[PDB]
Amino acid sequence: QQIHKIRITLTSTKVKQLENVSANIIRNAAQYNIVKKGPVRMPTKVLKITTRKTPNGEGSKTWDAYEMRIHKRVIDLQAPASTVKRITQITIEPGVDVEVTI
Amino acid sequence: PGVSVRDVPAQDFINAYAQFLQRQGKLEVPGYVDIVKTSAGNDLPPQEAETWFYKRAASIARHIYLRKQVGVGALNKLYGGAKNRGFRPHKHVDASGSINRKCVQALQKIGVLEISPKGGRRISENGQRDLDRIAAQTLEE
Amino acid sequence: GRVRTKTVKRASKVLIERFYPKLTLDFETNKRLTSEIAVIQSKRLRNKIAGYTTHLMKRIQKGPVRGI
Amino acid sequence: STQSVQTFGKKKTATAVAHVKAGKGLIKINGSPITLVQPEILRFKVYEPLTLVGLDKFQGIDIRVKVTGGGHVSQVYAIRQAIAKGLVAYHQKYVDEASKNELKKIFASYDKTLLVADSRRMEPKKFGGRGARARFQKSY
Amino acid sequence: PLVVQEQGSFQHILRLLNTNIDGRIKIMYALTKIRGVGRRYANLVCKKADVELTKRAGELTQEELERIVTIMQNPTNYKIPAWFLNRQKDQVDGKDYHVLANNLESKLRDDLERLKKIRSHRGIRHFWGLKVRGQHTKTTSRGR
Amino acid sequence: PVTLAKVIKVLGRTGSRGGVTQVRVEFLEDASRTIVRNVKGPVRENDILCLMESEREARRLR
Amino acid sequence: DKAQHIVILDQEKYDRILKDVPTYKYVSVSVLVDRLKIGGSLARVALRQLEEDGIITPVLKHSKQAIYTRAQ
Amino acid sequence: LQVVELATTIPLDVQEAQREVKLFNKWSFEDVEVKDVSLVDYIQIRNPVFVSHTAGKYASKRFRKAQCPIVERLTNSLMMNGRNNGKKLKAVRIVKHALEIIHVLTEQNPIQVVVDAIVNSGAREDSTRIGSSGTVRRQAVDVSPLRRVNQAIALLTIGAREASFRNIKTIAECLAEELINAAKGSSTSYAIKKKDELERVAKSNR
Amino acid sequence: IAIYAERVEERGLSAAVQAEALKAKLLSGLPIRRAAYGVLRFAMGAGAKGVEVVISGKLRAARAKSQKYADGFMIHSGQPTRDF
RNA sequence: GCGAUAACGAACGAGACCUUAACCUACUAAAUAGUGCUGCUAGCAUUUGCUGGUAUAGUCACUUCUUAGAGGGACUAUCGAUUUCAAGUCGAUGGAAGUUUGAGGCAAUAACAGGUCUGUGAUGCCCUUAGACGUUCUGGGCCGCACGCGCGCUACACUGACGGAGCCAGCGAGUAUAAGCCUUGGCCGAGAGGUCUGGGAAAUCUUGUGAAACUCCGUCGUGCUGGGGAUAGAGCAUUGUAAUUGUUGCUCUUCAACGAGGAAUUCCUAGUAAGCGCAAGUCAUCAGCUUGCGUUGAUUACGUCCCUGCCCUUUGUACACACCG
Ligand SMILES: [Mg+2]
Ligand SMILES: [Mg+2]
Ligand SMILES: [Mg+2]
Ligand SMILES: [Mg+2]
Ligand SMILES: [Mg+2]
Ligand SMILES: [Mg+2]
Ligand SMILES: [Mg+2]
Ligand SMILES: [Mg+2]
Ligand SMILES: [Mg+2]
Ligand SMILES: [Mg+2]
Ligand SMILES: [Mg+2]
Ligand SMILES: [Mg+2]
Ligand SMILES: [Mg+2]
Ligand SMILES: [Mg+2]
Ligand SMILES: [Mg+2]
Ligand SMILES: [Mg+2]
Ligand SMILES: [Mg+2]
Ligand SMILES: [Mg+2]
Ligand SMILES: [Mg+2]
Ligand SMILES: [Mg+2]
Ligand SMILES: [Mg+2]
Ligand SMILES: [Mg+2]
Ligand SMILES: [Mg+2]
Ligand SMILES: [Mg+2]
Ligand SMILES: [Mg+2]
Ligand SMILES: [Mg+2]
Ligand SMILES: [Mg+2]
Ligand SMILES: [Mg+2]
Ligand SMILES: [Mg+2]
């Protein structure tokens, strides 16, 4: 249980904080001589819901088209498990959730 | 230079492999081929009663040659077509499972295909050998 | 149609009355100049302003223009 | 390695990736010769980039394309674009540009879509009708 | 596999199961004139009787015509599947049958009173001449 | 006896629905006798259109 | 209802076919039906043999359309 | 003239095309000429094509249709009546077969006959209506060259379409009969009756 | 879980606070004109670029009515309404 | 907007703005994307070639195709015409894009007795409140059929039906001690469907959703015919506690009107219309419905106020609860 091939999966609705956390981890993985793979832009998922505008059923048939974009990024690190987890606390952000899988 | 299956038109290659497979005669034909229709979406049985099974087995062999571990469920979707729902709009419906499963099972005991790892049915060591042969006897005219 | 609006027509002619010596008859050169002269919120308005400024510059060399 | 250039042509959704290598003039569609393209009535759409310049241009190069997406017709226009763009791109990199500009002249004077991808895409559908502009029949 | 000629052998009008069949119709589709014989059923009796479908009705000889009417009246004896039959799992004797031209409307009728005798809902709507399979009637079927 | 007349000037859309155009025609031979005539289909200048009858002018249409 | 085209080929019509088809600028399924009064199916088998017998030269081959011409 | 050997073999007949571009590699544009001075600029035969299928953008601007190949404008008009809209591959088959029938008959160049049938079918004066909100007031007006050309294609394909309906004659050979008769100006053909009747009514309005 | 309560820095710029404050005044029987102008001036005093208040319903009268009270500069269309 | 100008200079709305689609061999990377090489390996002619499989250690190379973030790129650019030489408009050339680049989202000042208290544990008032108008259980009905009307789906055939064969998308969705999701692959079954395993909380698996129109080759041959498939009889499965008033699917049989539709009337200008399917919503089951998506892909204007509707100016007014005066 030392240096491992470690995956960090990043998902969020907003891209600005996602790229800051993504860039901040890459920055800390640069000055620390840790070989890295990423970030990998997964195809963004558009969660679309199309309802009727009318609470009743009167009027022209008009529809809303709501959206919820989900952006997912995975970054591969080659470092011991203690090092990667403390990096996560360095780059903790409310919007982006992190899951770590070996 | 050599000849492969991909170097011959598909439509007249199958007509040549079908002719060989009928004259060879070793392919086992199930007893209901004179009764059944190819798909539940079809309304009539094939018009080439004596030869339709051979040509379909020839089509199945060529289609498997070009791909990797195709299952029998995928074969039903491929040969299925638009059903003639009376007043409702048309829809795609898969072909009959037994006809395709019997062909690949029949083709498995004639030596052309075999069950591939991780599902599907690969082409046999001899399956490549004998299909490429038929292609050569197709384009000499 | 391609009728420019007032937010681009009046903003472009303020530039000429203020930065005529540095302007030119080239859109590409004018486009870069207005990014350091004006604070434009959107890229599309920046090219639109410079593209009409170029038209006014091209028109000034043929005679006097109204509003400048 | 060797003198290899890789390009692509596109139609509505179809995209054909062309690899142009130095060789004896091998020209295959998904591993099959172009002389056996299924849409027979359109076989001359892919024959156009060949007979326009002359088959002598393909002696030293071999081309293998992989076309996916789109439909049957949309794929034919994607293939002919990848071939035409691939021949031009090879000359620009491994031949003098005088010859590359010569080939591009004949192609453009015959069909813009040989080199320039068509920008037309399907308009989105809007509610209140079964199509982009079409609307449900109205009654009073 | 080529054009052939004949004289005096063609028969313009056929009579099978007390039904008149046009002799210039192809054999597979001529039998569909016989009520109770559809396209799907006619395709198989010709194939079970070794009558190639490329023949017109008048081309057939008497020997072939009798061989077909024998099969239609005894389908199960010629490896015709039970599920392929007109009247399978019969009401009274429970055996698989295929009713034909004159027998069809008689046993179709016998089913109607059998529905009406027990006074079931489906039999009643059959009596009224209305749709029995649940179809809507407020806006369709207004002809006469 | 048809006569051909090249158009030299598109005057404007006339007629009730605007489907007909006033145009100024000049004859290919004998480049004179310029006449104003009405035309049904879409017209640019320099379109070679023949006249079944030549001796008739045109004015604004209803 | 008035068509009543002949579907069985007798001997009087057979040699009339071989005596009339050569004197045609253009023969097809409809041309045979239109002028020889034979059925469409009988025309198709007639065209495929007359080509095999050399009387008729195939201009174009297609399932839905058979374009043929005289061989003389 | 040389036969060029490639690794991917090219048939002999199709190689006979580097010298000249021919319609379906069978029909030459060299010997084709519009027999009317007034429609030369609107019948486009100057740029040869192999197959009447280019998928170009001729509906963007106003007069781009005049730049489309004349055979492609014809195959566009075939695919009508709902069930045929968008079936261009079928339309190309009819045109390809129609030309061969036009070739075996009268032995002329098939696309020369097409040009002759179009110049002979377009009415030169049509009587437009100028009614002032209901009353009948017919007025005789001239016909532009563009509408003259493209109504010929509309009438030629409409006549061929109706001749093949519920008829054993195939559409390709119904088009051939319609095109051949109208090319030689015969009044038996549809779209020649219509052209004369249009020009006849215009004579009854001046 | 941990919950923290934080004071809003600029109470005048929060429409939620201004709407709840107005309700607590309207429910006290205060006149609408005095209540409406109390949020118009409180919003502007905090530094808002603009403010508009609409009150709809029934007040002693059987028929219902709505009244708008604008002030300053207001934008209506496009994305910036989602931003500012 | 130019311009005329007792106006000058402005604000909302429009436009700007935002989302999406089309370009980038110019940056940033990608074993959940792809490729060439390279290991190992198959078939065919042997010329070293052509098609493959394999490859999560070849501990390779690359980012063109794929994904998405930071940017760049179009501003009517240049040149011809017309114009008050103004705002502009029309042509070419270059361009990925020159119709606001294509499409949408948002959208002013007021207003309607427009529609919803059957969306709300949103509501004032009235009614009811224990034999309830609450709520629950059982069964039926909302489908009920002499008829009129509207949104649609199939069709009336040969530019076609079948029968084989060829065989291409995009938008999306998917579960656990449940109350059961998407389901390949194998094996049964003519089918519908059944069964055994495995994968996938997902760019990984279903899935390249091998879709349908479409194309090729055949049968049919102008015939209410092999067009069309209502209506109905008998039988086989699925879902569900429960299918009778057939949920749906499948098999055989019956095979009706309809032979292109009067007066009228709808939608539509380019990847548009029309076909053609597929996915998502409803959903135990049922999509002839909507919301989207892509395949094939046109004819004809690019004009006008003739009809119709709306806006503006002038005008009349005994209306202002505003002609429902
Ligand atoms: Mg299929
Ligand atoms: Mg199929
Ligand atoms: Mg159908
Ligand atoms: Mg149908
Ligand atoms: Mg026909
Ligand atoms: Mg604004
Ligand atoms: Mg806006
Ligand atoms: Mg504003
Ligand atoms: Mg790997
Ligand atoms: Mg390898
Ligand atoms: Mg827009
Ligand atoms: Mg109301
Ligand atoms: Mg009301
Ligand atoms: Mg309530
Ligand atoms: Mg309530
Ligand atoms: Mg609700
Ligand atoms: Mg109670
Ligand atoms: Mg209801
Ligand atoms: Mg009921
Ligand atoms: Mg509706
Ligand atoms: Mg078919
Ligand atoms: Mg997938
Ligand atoms: Mg039925
Ligand atoms: Mg019938
Ligand atoms: Mg209307
Ligand atoms: Mg239900
Ligand atoms: Mg659904
Ligand atoms: Mg609904
Ligand atoms: Mg007044």
Short mmCIF file of C-alpha atoms in Angstrom, two decimals, chain E residues 4-11 58-59, chain G residues 8-11:
data_model
loop_
_atom_site.label_atom_id
_atom_site.label_comp_id
_atom_site.label_asym_id
_atom_site.label_seq_id
_atom_site.Cartn_x
_atom_site.Cartn_y
_atom_site.Cartn_z
CA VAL E 4 -43.48 -23.15 -73.63
CA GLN E 5 -46.75 -23.71 -75.47
CA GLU E 6 -49.71 -26.03 -75.00
CA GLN E 7 -52.98 -26.77 -76.80
CA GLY E 8 -56.24 -28.09 -75.37
CA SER E 9 -54.81 -28.78 -71.89
CA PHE E 10 -55.65 -25.42 -70.31
CA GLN E 11 -58.89 -25.29 -68.31
CA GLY E 58 -55.57 -24.45 -65.71
CA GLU E 59 -52.08 -25.89 -66.16
CA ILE G 8 -51.01 -18.85 -71.85
CA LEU G 9 -48.80 -18.93 -74.95
CA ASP G 10 -50.21 -21.00 -77.82
CA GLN G 11 -48.48 -21.78 -81.13
#
